[PDB]
């Protein structure tokens, strides 16, 4: 019996007899798998819970893949095809819908809505970067637009289009709060280190440039050992939920390794004291860095569709906090540094467009199916965090560069626009968040 | 067939004006199921109804009430075992005044007066004084071990910055949610956001009046006392006082009677009790510049900035503010009420003269139980005193002592004692008022904060931040030595401490 004949709908991965004979009632095709003690087993709604009751405590199973149905096989293939055109044109919202109809994952739909909803506010983003660009640097204009934009877009995302988004997905704490905020020591000391070694790889190439690769070796390294010994044992001290904790401990390195050498530049460098180097290292990475992070026969199909899924690291499941990652430091990128380079809205809108078409692709054909067609948090903060600190830094850029001590301002004038702005940001979000939380 | 005879648990009140109309009997028909009696009121045009009211025909009389369109107004009548049990309540507080009161009495009055507005009120007063009782402790502790260094104390000021934010912390996130689902259990009886920013502008141009006469008459009394040789110089010193204390009512009196009620109007609030929050949070504008502009502009232009500046002269004023000041508000809310009504009667005794109040016991010939409960009923609508738990006033007035506290305890550490004596007497006060002379709101049957705590967090923060900035200025005290770019930088910087601290908090204990 073919098993695509069979029309399979969910697989059960084990390495025994005892499940074989639970089958009794259900249809099932055994096959090993892409290791001999590993075996692909082919299952075909009128099971409801007891199925996942019996395999929670069957404990002779090593993963539950919920598989793609024939037909909406062919469904999903339909999809990617409409996706497939309109490469260069905003993507269209009923694609979500259908997609989330088809699939009911609650992971893509939410990525894909936030990544639709980031294109969308870009594209004015993108005509208005291009508008000024060529009707340039450090202009107010760009800056106040950018200072809008970032607010409104916030505010519009975290409590217009997410509440109707994830709510419809979704259809000794204390103790435990307290061992995360133990946390906050170890975190700011390997920050410290990581940022001196910025400052001291900065200063010895400036020296070199100037009056006369560490980087690239030294960042990888600590991240393997801050978590080696500091973020996995005492996420198993707080003992939970788990995932999103060793992203939020994970991320104070990443922010730093990412926007560090440009700030620096930019508040120290130039003050202090090439004319043209900040452009270069602004497209170094605004450009560079962005493709680089961007980058029967039907039977052995579909049992190298389960070996892909189980191996092939690019059809494994889906884990939305990296994409979310890797959008929300190019909007941190965006919204912090645009002023240099008004065309950083046009470059942003092709990088995004290009990879919704890409993730797209890779969620629906080849990602690991993750919900049954039958029966956020920490990111939301961080995209909060990056409006404030975009929004606070532009308007001190721009305060500052209006005419480039090549400032014409004193730095207690710098700090006072700095906590100025900081202030009616923090206000305006506020009363943008209440205007539209009465809707 | 007595009032008391039949123990009253509801007083309908209505406009028997149109005698014509005859709703009285419309409501006696309405009540073929239970028994009433219907008598003349405090005034010819008003006459209550006292009923007895229970559940099983509870919510036809509202319906037909509503329906009727014509009730002045509805009273939950305490019955004689309710009665009963207050003023037992009541003498139990009459008893240990000493000890601030435990929270056995709270559960107590929440099972009683099932009011959640008092039980509320009651509650933050409670945790208020309980958090105080350890910083009057601490304050007296740093005022006579440290002798003569007792102003400006580092320590006392990191303890007031932390004490200040758990107590925050503690009652938003800990006790209010309790008592909000507690309460909540008996629940007995677009464009208007965009129309409340647009009162903002309305906000900004009321109360930039009120700061600049508030600088002019602090000019003026500096002017007065320091450069001046005028005859009568001591005479002229008390003008600006009076000029503040007759400016700060008109002002209220014009913000309200032309900018809130008609803004008010202008947002269309559905929800009355939303009405009523927006207008207070307007009114709040005018409250907090009059109350503590005085001593910031003191503190921070008098002494800095600056013929010799008098030295205790910030003693001076707090002295007034923390001290005086505070009887004066907790009297104009107390006695002063009853001290109009009795001038009242000296400059027109009987300016009202409705003769249907004196010729009503000749009308009726009640009993003196039955003329008690209709003088009951008729202070309940007529005594300033009698009038429904207003939770907002109140709330008002402890926060603005609590923001007293929190921003100028750096100077007197013997403050929180005061606030102790103070609010103990106050608690007992209001708990003597609102379970025996305030008018009910809730049945104990059922029937089919919001703002404060925003202002209170407002509060913490601003207290946290201009204790810390006080005692950066004074601790080692143009007489400061320091740069104002430092202290303006240290601002902001305690400011987010303090946020950050808040939001731990708030974190450690919302999470249970």
């Known amino acids: 019996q073919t098993i695509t004949s069979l029309d399979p709908n969910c ?19 055994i096959e090993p798998g892409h290791d001999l003690q590993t075996s692909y087993a082919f299952i075909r709604q009128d099971n409801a819970k007891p199925l996942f009751s019996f395999l929670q405590n069957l404990d002779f199973i090593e993963s ?65 970067g291009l508008s000024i660009r060529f009707l340039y640097e450090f202009n107010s204009t760009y800056s106040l637009f950018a200072i809008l934009w970032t607010l409104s877009f916030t505010a519009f995302w975290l409590y217009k289009y997410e509440p109707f988004w994830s709510d419809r997905l979704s259809k000794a704490s204390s103790v435990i709060m307290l061992k995360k905020c133990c946390f906050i020591p170890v975190a700011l000391l390997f920050g410290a280190i990581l940022l001196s070694f910025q400052l001291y790889c900065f200063a010895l190439e400036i020296f070199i440039k100037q009056i006369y690769i560490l980087i690239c070796t030294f960042t990888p390294v600590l991240t393997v050992i801050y978590n080696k010994y500091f973020v996995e044992p005492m996420t198993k001290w707080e003992n939970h939920n788990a995932k999103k904790s060793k992203e939020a401990k994970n ?36 450009v560079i860095n962005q493709l680089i992070q961007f980058s029967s026969s039907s039977d052995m199909k579909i049992w190298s569709k389960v070996k892909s899924y189980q191996t092939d690291p690019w059809g494994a499941t889906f884990d939305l906090d990296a994409n979310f990652k890797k959008l929300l430091l190019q909007f941190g990128y965006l919204v912090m540094f645009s002023t240099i380079w008004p065309l950083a809205p046009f470059i942003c809108l092709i990088v995004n467009l290009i990879v919704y078409q890409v993730d797209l692709r890779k969620a629906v054909l080849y990602s690991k199916p993750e919900y049954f067609p039958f029966p956020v948090g920490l990111w939301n903060s961080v995209l909060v965090m ?34 100025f702005i900081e202030h009616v940001s923090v206000a305006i979000f506020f009363l943008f968040s209440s205007i539209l939380k009465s809707s």
């Open 251 to 286: 991320f104070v390195i990443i922010f730093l390794s990412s926007y560090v050498p440009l700030l620096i530049t930019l508040f120290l460098y130039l003050p202090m004291g090439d004319t043209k180097r900040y452009e270069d290292q602004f497209f170094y990475f605004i």
């Open 11 to 29: 697989v059960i991965v084990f390495n025994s007899l005892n499940v074989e004979f639970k089958r009794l009632n259900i249809h099932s095709i």
């Open 386 to 419: 990056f409006s404030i600190l975009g929004c606070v830094i532009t308007a001190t850029l721009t305060y500052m560069y209006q005419s480039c001590n090549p400032i014409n301002h004193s730095w207690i004038n710098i700090v006072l626009y700095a906590v």
């Open 64 to 128: 539950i893949i919920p598989y793609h149905d024939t037909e909406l096989s062919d469904d999903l293939h339909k999809l990617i095809s409409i996706s497939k055109s309109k490469i260069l044109e905003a993507p269209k919202q009923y694609e979500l819908y259908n997609l989330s109809n088809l699939t009911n994952n609650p992971k893509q739909s939410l990525y894909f809505a936030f990544l639709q909803n980031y294109i969308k506010w870009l594209i004015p983003f993108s005509f208005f």
